[PDB]
A = this chain, B = another copy of it.
């Protein structure tokens, strides 16, 4: 089931992991360019959605506020999660927000092109990334409105 409370198109938000409490950031310099972060609020943690239409209905591009790049999540090449210019030129720029089966207030950030979800954990490296496999709680996110 698609997450029923997706931010209106163009509205700004942070993406905060339910369990770790870390947020996603997206910047243009100093790798990792897209990763999780535990610390103060900065602009590179702010995103907006472009709503998919036609074949991309129910998918969304996740655009960085300060730099305008959109997120990607892929299994083809490192870095697996990153950013790129444009408004969703590539199929791996398109995400589905899938509500959790048990917790109605959290969702997985799912990528149809790569069949992956994003995760945030405090255990093994890489502590942030994408994953094709079983459902774990570390894959659960909130939209944090600003």
Contacts and interface: CB of A to CB of B under 8 A. Distances in A.
Interface residues of A, number: 19
A132 interface: yes
A124 interface: no
Could you say how many copies of this chain the assembly holds? 2
A2 B110 CA distance: 12
Nearest to A112: B58
Contacts of A133: 1
A58 B133 CA distance: 16
Interface in A102-116: 112-113, 115
Interface of A: 1-2, 54-59, 91, 94, 96, 101, 112-113, 115, 132-135
